[PDB]
DNA sequence: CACACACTCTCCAATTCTCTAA
DNA sequence: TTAGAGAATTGGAGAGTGTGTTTTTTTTTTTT
């Protein structure tokens, strides 16, 4: 719907202007565009990530920070796209072999006091949470597809650049092009990222008396 | 729901064994009547009140403990009449769609609950005390209205179909109907019904009382009911033990026949045979796989399944099975029959026929008339027979009335397609009344009185002189249909035809009886040759298929008529049929063939005649396959 | 497709039908007086076999119920009066 | 309406009835109504008075009483037991409704004790299927009690009619036609768990008792199933007489139904619609209607004590020098040692256990030790005590098991998990533990 | 509006009766009045104090005692063990709109409040549970042997259409089967569907196994056990090894696995929990009343309190005053501390 | 996946309704 | 009046669609 696309574009523009306009310092000393310069230096170093503080975002635009707290799954995609285009306008022109723009991972952090694993009740679902713990296990790095292309097995038609939802959730392949399951996923024409599952044990200070330590 | 709940709960509260009514309970029952009068077509208020069980919870205690409050009491009576109204009246007809049929079933279920609740004797005690006062008083419009509504309440509670899934009750366990009848007996309302039937002062209620009596007697038949002596319980104990013994021995014999049919080796014990002299459905010989013991009595349909005959082609089946009522109820009902036949029959039946003459009766009340005409006449025939107590219905007028009703039901069965089964059930009632009148005119010849012998000869002379009573049997046989009429109809028709032909034979062989109907000449064998038709023999064979389940009298009648039709008229070739020969094969192969000596001897006689004809020529086998008209004379 | 047999008059006047039934009892023999049950068993066995060969789909009693009605039709009746006597 | 007032309105009635079973029903009802005890009148009316209680639903009937009533009836019940059993339950329901206090939905059960003939476990051939049978065996394992759906109440999802009393057999079966005659539905049904009826259910593994085991043969085991009041009365290790009927139980995993799908070395049967292309195997199960031992509180004492027992215990209480009389009677084989006999008698009588205000117990049981040479009667005292008293235990100081006088912890390979094996003192809880060779314990027990 | 009634007389079953609108409203009003008018033996308004102590700590769960519910409102105590799910839902609604009368802004803290019934007198041994107890409120005791983690369970699920953006409206999840839409009302596509993970409402779930306590009846016999389901705030009320006392609805459902295991139509059973106490933690600070605190702090004013406490340890033991003193000091215990945030020392004696 | 349950959907034909001749 | 030929209505057989499918290390208690 055009209204929905307008909402997404407006929120993306607001995140873009946050990354373009945010400053730290005073007129008595000087100003540095914190996230502009972080984006530029990280992209030129080939890092392709930044670390947006929730308190800074709240100070610039409290509504964006509240939306990102309540609905991070929706709005982090817009924030990452905003960071990508800000990186484009901040870095270009680029030398040979660096013409194609790379995706930017917008990590984020907060000064707020953290919650705990046993405090994570059902009402915290799909919200931002901040919990401490100890890593007890760490998986080997495995590849997860972020975009795929699927080719019909019978007639060799192709659907390309299907956006995969982030996280451990998957994607449902269409049942219409042919057979009931017409498609296979093309192993070459898909883009993947590293992912790693961890087990986060509750802090021994945080375990209630007589309990075993939970893990998440 | 909420307003109805508030208004019904407003009535009263029950404390232990006592009921306390709120002061506005009269206005409350009036409100309930108002809701019932403004139901939806789904009978929603009746459903909701039945679900709430307000009748059992409130109205029965109010009836049994606050009948002194007369303005409340009559409103309660009217409310109970409206609630207990039969479902067929509530919906107009038996529905044919799922939703409305469900609504019908729900209302019917609550009627089951009402009938179960009304067996409490105090309800009919109060009703009988009230109606006793009313009939002592009898007179006002309100008074006769209250009498009518009490009688309609009794009619309504008697007239519910018993839900025999829940009333799945054994030989003489007391059903809900039995308990209701026993409550009527203990309350003494049976005496009030007898008073209404015997009294000449209030004959307008005679039709209603006939309906009450017809609904009282439903499981019972008069021949069994009249024989219930005081010492019957011990006899029935020994009879039950004997019946269990013979049933168990029969089952053991059947088990051993099955065991010897199959081999003593296990199922997968293989081996296959070829029968060299027997062609398969192809050109090669048949290969048999089920073993020598199945070959010992080989049949070419061992592995086959029956055919799915369509719904419009399936035969009709019996709507009832003969569970007896409890023995105490049977004794009470026998006493009621005795007192009704002695004190009540002639005046009540004359009053009901007068009601039919005045034509204020409902559209099918002559069915009740013919029910009573069958039932109490047969009760009189059982035990000590006395035509004086039952003299009124021996008139020729009753024969004419039965004949016109039976022909009307016959025509409506042939025309009114949508209601043909009910017309068949009405024609069956008329046929039963006709049969019982033939039985009683047969019976009274044995009596020692010359006056009733004269009356018998008068009745026989005019009934056999008038042709329409005579040709009706050929009409019924020619348009009998198993698809619409149950086997009991055919059984009664065969019994009636045998009795009628017996009496006609005796009358023609003892007296001239030379003319019929405008007189025209008549002889007996001319009429008997009318029954030499394919349809008649087909129907008789159809009843003969159930020879094990048939009564001994039915087997005697069917074999006697078929032997008459084959031997005396010399038309054995009419009975040559291959279905008939399959019937004879099962009859001869029966292990119980010794119990059916007349049937097996008749089968051997007709088979010997067939094999004589077959030895004459091979055409007999082909002619045996197809039913056959008067061209059968070639074979004879 | 849908080559379902029917058992109408054309089936009954086929070679396996009444023309066969005219001849199936040529091999048969009967004992006669006082053994009508055994002769009946042989008779029903032969005609049951004939019915099975003619139209295997039905049980014998159901086949008889079908055919006793089906004989009224004019085609099989004309073939009947041909089989009776001779052509 | 006409006198032909019945179009078969709303009827799906039984077009045929089991004659033998219904005759058995009525004759068994007559037996319950008319068979009388020698010391009174109408025994089973009095015994059926107890069925109004919420927990009670089973009437225990003596088969020899049934034989004394009528031999043909008893033979028919014995030969046709599984066929006729629900009809007998209906007879009991008809008999017990005259108490007038029963719930309308309550099921009642008949349980035949005192069957004259007892069969071995080896004799439970397929020929015994469905017959009333009595067996003796030793219980090995008892499973948890469950509710078993005896008859479902279902709702038709596309005409909202309820269908009651849907009998089940073994697979969970919803009805296969709607009770509403014009309704076309044959699959879309919903169980009403609240208005459905359940019975308590337990299965127990038994094996051949020690007397019945053939020489040089593995013990044969059998699955017995107990219902209603019998669902915990037998425990593992007990030697019990079971009466009931050997039944055949299908491989329910192979059967698909409108209610539920299938859940998938010998061949088995084939060809059923519900079975599909699979093949159904069978196994033998003994459906026990009654269980008893093979050889057998203040309110309980007051009820059990008959007048002779009251007079006897009263005379004993007033018996002067009951001390020496009980010492002599309890230890007749012992010569002398009157003080020891008195002490052990006081051990049998014991003191009063008490609980302090702070919820801490004070011991009431006394403990007695008898030191002596191996040539003396110290073992004789323990043997007499353990022969005399019920619930007592005899043991050596050395353990004949991993657990000894006290519990020990052992793995079981059914879970590879630790559990406690009970010791002699726990087996002698609320009783007497006789411990010979007391000086030679292990350190754990000591 | 719907009119008030005598409640105990009706032609319906209890579940049907309390489901109907009229008596439901009457039950609601009665429980509301009971909460707002019940008093202690000394005359203290009990549930005002309990609701204040709940709303201070944001515990969103109100504990009610059966032994005085029966005293105040008879018919509510009558219907409660017979139709517990329905009556407890009605109690939850009434308690919620009492709490929103006492603390009108408490809907900001929680939108739903659970009434937890305690001291239910119809206690049952765990192995004595039978079909007679089905769908009725029971109380049992046992040791917790196993616990799942706290898991989110669907409670009010909205499904995204399998072929378009539409959200199919809320389905109330059951404990018997996963509720499903069938086909979408905006476009009748059918079969599989996606859960809207953001708009779907979840609830806390924890399934525990409890068996008979080892010393209760298991004298060498194996102990019987039952599964129980804890929902919403009842999760983390117990851990393995806890000698709990559990009140709950004895609930049963069809289980094909049990059917094939037993070869009979055997229905699985589970206890839908409604209250969890512990038989060792007979008193807790979360249950202390203001009167208890007042009389405790009055006792501390006495100069003899040390001697009273020492004399109060094991009062059925004579002498050993030094032992009682040392045990009192250990029973009360010292104060743990960590000076500098880098150096722990124990407080226990 | 290729071989079985369960459901929907399509057209063939099986049986009855109505008009006509014998 | 009774029975056979042409037209109309509904049962269900068959095709298509959708769905379902011993052996090693580490611990713990008890046996010697
Ligand atoms: Zn394709
Ligand atoms: Zn239905
Ligand atoms: Zn859609």
């Amino acid at each position: 719907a055009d209204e929905g696309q307008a909402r997404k574009s407006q929120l993306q523009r607001r995140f873009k202007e946050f990354l373009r306009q945010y400053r730290v310092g005073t007129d008595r000393t000087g100003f540095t565009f914190k996230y502009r310069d972080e984006l530029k230096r990280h992209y030129n170093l080939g890092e392709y990530w930044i670390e947006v503080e929730m308190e800074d975002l709240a100070s610039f635009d409290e509504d964006l920070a509240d939306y990102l707290y309540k609905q991070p799954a929706e709005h982090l995609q817009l924030l990452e796209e905003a960071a990508k285009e800000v990186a484009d306008e901040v870095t270009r022109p680029r030398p040979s072999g660096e013409e194609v723009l790379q995706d930017i991972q917008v990590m984020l952090k907060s000064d707020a006091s953290p919650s705990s694993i046993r405090s994570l009740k059902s009402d915290m679902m799909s919200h931002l949470v901040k919990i401490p713990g100890i890593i007890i296990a760490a998986s080997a790095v495995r590849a997860k597809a972020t975009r795929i292309s699927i080719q019909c097995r019978s007639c060799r038609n192709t659907l390309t650049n299907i956006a995969m939802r982030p996280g451990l959730e998957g994607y449902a392949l269409p049942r219409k092009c042919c057979p009931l399951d017409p498609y296979f996923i093309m192993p070459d024409k898909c883009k993947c990222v590293d992912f790693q599952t961890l087990k986060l044990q509750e802090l021994p200070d945080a375990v209630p008396h007589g309990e075993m330590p939970r893990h998440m | 729901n909420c307003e109805l709940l508030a208004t019904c709960s407003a009535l009263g509260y029950l404390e232990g064994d006592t009921y306390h009514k709120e002061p506005d309970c009269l206005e409350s029952v009036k409100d309930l009547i108002r809701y019932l009068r403004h139901e939806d077509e789904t009978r929603d208020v009746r459903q909701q009140l039945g679900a709430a069980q307000i009748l059992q919870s409130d109205l029965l205690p109010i009836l049994t403990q606050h009948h002194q409050d007369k303005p409340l009491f009559d409103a309660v009576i009217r409310l109970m009449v409206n609630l207990t109204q039969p479902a067929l009246l509530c919906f107009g007809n038996l529905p044919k769609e799922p939703s409305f049929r469900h609504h019908f079933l729900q209302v019917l279920t609550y009627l089951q609950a009402y009938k179960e609740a009304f067996a409490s004797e105090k309800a009919f005690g109060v009703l009988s005390e009230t109606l006793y006062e009313l009939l002592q008083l009898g007179r006002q419009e309100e008074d006769n209205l209250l009498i009518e509504r009490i009688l309609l309440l009794v009619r309504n509670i008697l007239h519910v179909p018993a839900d025999l899934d829940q009333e799945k009750k054994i030989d003489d366990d007391a059903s809900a109907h039995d308990q209701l009848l026993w409550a009527i007996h203990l309350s003494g309302l049976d005496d009030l019904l007898l008073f209404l039937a015997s009294s000449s002062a209030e004959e307008q209620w005679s039709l209603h009382v006939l309906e009450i009596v017809s609904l009282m007697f439903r499981d019972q038949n008069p021949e069994q009911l009249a024989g219930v002596g005081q010492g019957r319980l011990a006899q029935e104990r020994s009879a039950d033990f004997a019946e269990l013994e013979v049933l168990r021995q029969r089952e053991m014999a059947e088990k051993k026949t099955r065991a010897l049919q199959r081999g003593n080796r296990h199922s997968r014990f293989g081996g296959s045979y070829i029968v060299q002299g027997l062609k398969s459905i192809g050109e090669r010989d048949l290969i048999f796989h089920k073993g020598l013991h199945n070959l010992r009595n080989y049949s070419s349909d061992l592995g086959k399944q029956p055919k799915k005959v369509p719904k419009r082609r399936q035969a009709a089946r019996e709507l009832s099975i003969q569970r007896r009522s409890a023995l105490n109820v049977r004794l009470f009902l026998r006493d009621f029959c005795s007192e009704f036949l002695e004190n009540c029959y002639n005046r009540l039946m004359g009053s009901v026929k007068d009601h039919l003459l005045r034509e204020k009766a409902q559209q099918h009340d002559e069915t009740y008339y013919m029910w009573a005409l069958a039932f109490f006449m047969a009760f009189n025939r059982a035990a000590s027979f006395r035509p004086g107590l039952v003299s009124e219905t021996l008139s020729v007028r009753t024969f004419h009335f039965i004949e016109q009703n039976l022909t009307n039901y016959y025509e409506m069965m042939l025309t009114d397609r949508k209601e043909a089964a009910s017309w068949a059930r009405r024609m069956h009632l008329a046929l039963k009344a006709y049969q019982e009148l033939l039985a009683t005119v047969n019976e009274m010849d044995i009596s020692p009185d010359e006056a009733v012998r004269e009356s018998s000869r008068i009745i026989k002379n005019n009934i056999f002189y008038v042709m329409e009573y005579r040709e009706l049997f050929l009409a019924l046989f020619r348009k009998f249909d198993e698809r619409c009429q149950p086997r009991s109809f055919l059984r009664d028709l065969v019994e009636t035809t045998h009795l009628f032909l017996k009496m006609l034979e005796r009358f023609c062989r003892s007296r001239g009886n030379l003319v019929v109907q405008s007189e025209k000449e008549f002889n007996f064998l001319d009429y008997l040759k009318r029954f030499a038709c394919s349809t008649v023999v087909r129907a008789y064979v159809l009843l003969l298929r159930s020879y094990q389940q048939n009564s001994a009298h039915t087997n005697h009648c069917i074999v006697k008529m078929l032997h008459r039709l084959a031997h005396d008229l010399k038309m054995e070739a009419l009975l040559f049929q291959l279905s008939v020969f399959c019937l004879f094969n099962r009859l001869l192969s029966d292990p119980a063939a010794g119990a059916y000596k007349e049937l097996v001897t008749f089968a051997k006689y007709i088979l010997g005649k067939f094999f004589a004809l077959a030895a004459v020529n091979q055409k007999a086998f082909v002619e045996l396959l197809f039913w056959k008209n008067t061209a059968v004379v070639r074979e004879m | 497709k849908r080559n379902i047999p029917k058992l109408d008059a054309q089936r009954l006047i086929s070679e396996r039908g009444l023309p066969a039934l005219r001849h199936v009892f040529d091999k048969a023999k009967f004992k006669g007086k006082g053994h009508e049950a055994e002769d009946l068993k042989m008779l029903i066995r032969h005609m049951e076999h004939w019915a099975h060969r003619l139209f295997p789909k039905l049980q014998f009693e159901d086949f008889i119920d079908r055919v006793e009605y089906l004989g009224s039709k004019k085609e099989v009746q004309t073939c009947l009066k041909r089989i009776r006597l001779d052509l | 309406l006409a006198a032909a007032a019945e179009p078969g309105a709303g009827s799906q009635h039984l077009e045929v009835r089991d004659e033998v079973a219904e005759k058995c029903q009525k004759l068994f009802l007559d037996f319950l109504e008319e068979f009388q005890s020698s010391d009174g009148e109408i025994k089973y009316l009095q015994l059926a008075e107890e069925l109004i209680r919420p927990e009670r639903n089973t009437l225990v009937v003596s088969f020899v009483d049934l034989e004394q009533f009528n031999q043909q009836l008893s033979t028919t019940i014995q030969e046709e037991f599984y066929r006729v059993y629900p009809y007998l339950c209906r007879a009991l329901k008809t008999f017990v409704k005259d108490r007038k206090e029963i719930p309308l939905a309550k099921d009642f059960y008949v349980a035949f004790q005192d069957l004259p003939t007892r069969h071995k476990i080896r004799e439970l051939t397929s020929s015994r299927i469905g017959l009333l049978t009595r067996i003796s065996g030793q219980v090995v394992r008892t499973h948890p009690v469950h509710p078993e759906l005896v008859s479902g109440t279902f709702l038709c999802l596309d005409c909202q009619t309820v269908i009651r009393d849907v009998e089940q057999q073994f697979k969970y079966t919803q009805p296969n036609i709607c009770r509403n005659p014009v309704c076309a539905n044959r699959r879309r049904f919903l169980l009403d768990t609240n208005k459905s009826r359940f019975v308590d259910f337990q299965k127990v593994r038994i094996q051949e008792t020690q007397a019945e085991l053939p020489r040089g043969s593995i013990p044969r085991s059998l699955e017995v199933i107990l219902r209603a009041e019998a669902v915990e009365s037998a425990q593992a290790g007990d030697k019990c007489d079971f009466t009931g009927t050997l039944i055949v139980v299908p491989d329910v995993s192979k059967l698909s139904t409108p209610g539920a799908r299938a859940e998938t070395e010998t061949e088995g049967i084939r060809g059923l619609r519900a079975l599909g292309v699979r093949d159904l195997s069978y196994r033998l199960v003994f459906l026990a209607c009654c269980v008893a031992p093979t050889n057998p509180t203040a309110e309980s004492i007051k009820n059990q004590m008959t007048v002779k027992e009251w007079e006897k215990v009263f005379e004993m209480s007033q018996d002067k020098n009951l001390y020496h009389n009980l010492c002599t009677s309890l230890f007749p084989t012992i010569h002398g040692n009157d003080e020891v006999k008195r002490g052990v008698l006081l051990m049998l009588f014991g003191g009063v256990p008490k609980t302090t205000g702070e919820g801490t117990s004070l011991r009431g049981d006394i403990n007695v030790c008898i030191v002596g040479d191996p040539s003396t009667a110290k073992s004789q005292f323990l043997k007499h005590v353990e022969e005399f008293s019920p619930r007592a235990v005899y043991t050596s100081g050395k353990a004949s098991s991993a657990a000894g006088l006290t519990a020990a912890v052992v793995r079981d390979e059914e879970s590879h998990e630790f559990v406690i094996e009970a010791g002699a003192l726990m087996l002698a809880d609320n009783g007497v533990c006789c411990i010979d060779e007391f000086d030679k314990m292990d350190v754990r027990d000591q | 509006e719907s009119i008030e009634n005598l409640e105990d007389l009706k032609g319906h079953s209890v579940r049907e009766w309390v489901s109907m609108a009229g008596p439901r409203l009457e039950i609601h009003h009665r429980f509301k009045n009971f909460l707002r008018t019940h008093v202690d033996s000394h005359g203290h308004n009990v549930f005002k104090e309990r609701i204040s102590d709940m709303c201070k700590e944001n515990r969103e769960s109100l504990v009610v005692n059966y032994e005085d519910l029966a005293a105040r409102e008879h018919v509510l105590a009558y219907f409660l063990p017979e139709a517990p799910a329905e009556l407890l839902q009605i109690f939850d609604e009434a308690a919620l709109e009492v709490v929103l009368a006492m603390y009108p802004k408490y809907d900001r803290i929680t939108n739903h409040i659970h009434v937890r019934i305690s001291h239910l007198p119809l206690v049952e041994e765990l192995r004595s549970l039978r079909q007679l107890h089905l769908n009725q409120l029971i109380r049992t005791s046992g040791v917790v042997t196993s616990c799942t983690g706290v898991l989110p369970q669907l409670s009010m699920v909205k499904y995204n259409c399998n072929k378009c953006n539409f959200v199919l409206g809320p389905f109330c999840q059951s404990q018997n089967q996963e509720v499903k839409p069938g086909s979408c009302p905006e476009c009748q596509s059918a079969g599989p569907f996606e859960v809207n993970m953001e708009e779907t409402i979840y609830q806390n779930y924890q399934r525990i196994r409890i068996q008979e306590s080892p010393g209760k009846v298991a004298a060498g016999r194996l102990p019987r056990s039952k599964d129980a389901i804890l929902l919403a705030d009842l999760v983390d009320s117990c851990k393995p090894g806890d000698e709990i006392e559990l009140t709950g609805i004895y609930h049963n459902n069809y289980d094909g696995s049990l059917n094939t295991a037993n070869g009979f139509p055997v229905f699985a059973t589970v206890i839908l929990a409604n209250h969890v106490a512990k038989k060792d933690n007979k008193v807790a600070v979360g249950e202390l009343t203001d009167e208890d605190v007042k009389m405790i702090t009055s006792l501390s004013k006495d100069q003899q309190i040390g001697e009273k406490i020492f004399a109060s340890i094991a009062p059925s033991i004579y002498g050993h005053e030094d032992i009682k003193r040392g045990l009192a000091l250990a029973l009360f215990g010292g104060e743990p501390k960590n000076p500098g945030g880098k150096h722990k020392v124990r407080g226990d004696i």
Side-chain angles (χ1 to χ4, degrees), chain B residues 352-358:
Chain B
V352 170
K353 192 67 169 64
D354 182 58
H355 273 73
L356 273 305
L357 258 291
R358 289 144 72 178

PDB file of all heavy atoms in Angstrom, chain B residues 352-358:
ATOM      1  N   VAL B 352     -69.318 -42.401  19.311  1.00  0.00           N
ATOM      2  CA  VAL B 352     -68.249 -42.019  18.392  1.00  0.00           C
ATOM      3  C   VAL B 352     -68.743 -42.075  16.950  1.00  0.00           C
ATOM      4  O   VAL B 352     -68.413 -41.206  16.134  1.00  0.00           O
ATOM      5  CB  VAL B 352     -67.009 -42.909  18.613  1.00  0.00           C
ATOM      6  CG1 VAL B 352     -65.968 -42.700  17.498  1.00  0.00           C
ATOM      7  CG2 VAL B 352     -66.394 -42.627  19.993  1.00  0.00           C
ATOM      8  N   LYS B 353     -69.529 -43.099  16.605  1.00  0.00           N
ATOM      9  CA  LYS B 353     -70.109 -43.136  15.268  1.00  0.00           C
ATOM     10  C   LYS B 353     -71.083 -41.983  15.065  1.00  0.00           C
ATOM     11  O   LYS B 353     -71.185 -41.441  13.960  1.00  0.00           O
ATOM     12  CB  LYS B 353     -70.801 -44.481  15.028  1.00  0.00           C
ATOM     13  CG  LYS B 353     -71.190 -44.761  13.572  1.00  0.00           C
ATOM     14  CD  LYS B 353     -69.970 -44.939  12.672  1.00  0.00           C
ATOM     15  CE  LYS B 353     -70.352 -45.483  11.304  1.00  0.00           C
ATOM     16  NZ  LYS B 353     -71.221 -44.546  10.540  1.00  0.00           N
ATOM     17  N   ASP B 354     -71.786 -41.578  16.124  1.00  0.00           N
ATOM     18  CA  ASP B 354     -72.625 -40.389  16.043  1.00  0.00           C
ATOM     19  C   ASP B 354     -71.783 -39.141  15.814  1.00  0.00           C
ATOM     20  O   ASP B 354     -72.197 -38.231  15.090  1.00  0.00           O
ATOM     21  CB  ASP B 354     -73.456 -40.250  17.318  1.00  0.00           C
ATOM     22  CG  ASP B 354     -74.380 -39.051  17.283  1.00  0.00           C
ATOM     23  OD1 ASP B 354     -75.214 -38.969  16.357  1.00  0.00           O
ATOM     24  OD2 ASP B 354     -74.276 -38.192  18.184  1.00  0.00           O
ATOM     25  N   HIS B 355     -70.606 -39.072  16.440  1.00  0.00           N
ATOM     26  CA  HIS B 355     -69.699 -37.953  16.197  1.00  0.00           C
ATOM     27  C   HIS B 355     -69.239 -37.925  14.746  1.00  0.00           C
ATOM     28  O   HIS B 355     -69.141 -36.851  14.138  1.00  0.00           O
ATOM     29  CB  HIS B 355     -68.492 -38.033  17.132  1.00  0.00           C
ATOM     30  CG  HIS B 355     -68.713 -37.388  18.463  1.00  0.00           C
ATOM     31  ND1 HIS B 355     -69.516 -37.945  19.436  1.00  0.00           N
ATOM     32  CD2 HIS B 355     -68.237 -36.233  18.984  1.00  0.00           C
ATOM     33  CE1 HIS B 355     -69.525 -37.159  20.499  1.00  0.00           C
ATOM     34  NE2 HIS B 355     -68.756 -36.113  20.250  1.00  0.00           N
ATOM     35  N   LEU B 356     -68.936 -39.094  14.180  1.00  0.00           N
ATOM     36  CA  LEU B 356     -68.578 -39.150  12.765  1.00  0.00           C
ATOM     37  C   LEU B 356     -69.750 -38.718  11.888  1.00  0.00           C
ATOM     38  O   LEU B 356     -69.556 -38.044  10.870  1.00  0.00           O
ATOM     39  CB  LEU B 356     -68.116 -40.559  12.374  1.00  0.00           C
ATOM     40  CG  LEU B 356     -66.645 -40.984  12.541  1.00  0.00           C
ATOM     41  CD1 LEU B 356     -65.664 -40.043  11.833  1.00  0.00           C
ATOM     42  CD2 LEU B 356     -66.270 -41.139  14.006  1.00  0.00           C
ATOM     43  N   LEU B 357     -70.970 -39.109  12.262  1.00  0.00           N
ATOM     44  CA  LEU B 357     -72.154 -38.675  11.520  1.00  0.00           C
ATOM     45  C   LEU B 357     -72.314 -37.160  11.578  1.00  0.00           C
ATOM     46  O   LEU B 357     -72.579 -36.509  10.560  1.00  0.00           O
ATOM     47  CB  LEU B 357     -73.412 -39.362  12.067  1.00  0.00           C
ATOM     48  CG  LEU B 357     -73.994 -40.547  11.286  1.00  0.00           C
ATOM     49  CD1 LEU B 357     -74.599 -40.085   9.964  1.00  0.00           C
ATOM     50  CD2 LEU B 357     -72.958 -41.642  11.054  1.00  0.00           C
ATOM     51  N   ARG B 358     -72.152 -36.579  12.768  1.00  0.00           N
ATOM     52  CA  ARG B 358     -72.217 -35.132  12.926  1.00  0.00           C
ATOM     53  C   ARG B 358     -71.017 -34.432  12.299  1.00  0.00           C
ATOM     54  O   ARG B 358     -71.077 -33.221  12.057  1.00  0.00           O
ATOM     55  CB  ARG B 358     -72.332 -34.780  14.413  1.00  0.00           C
ATOM     56  CG  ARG B 358     -73.697 -35.129  15.013  1.00  0.00           C
ATOM     57  CD  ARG B 358     -73.620 -35.635  16.454  1.00  0.00           C
ATOM     58  NE  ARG B 358     -73.297 -34.589  17.418  1.00  0.00           N
ATOM     59  CZ  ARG B 358     -73.216 -34.767  18.732  1.00  0.00           C
ATOM     60  NH1 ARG B 358     -73.421 -35.950  19.294  1.00  0.00           N
ATOM     61  NH2 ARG B 358     -72.921 -33.727  19.507  1.00  0.00           N
TER      62      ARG B 358
END
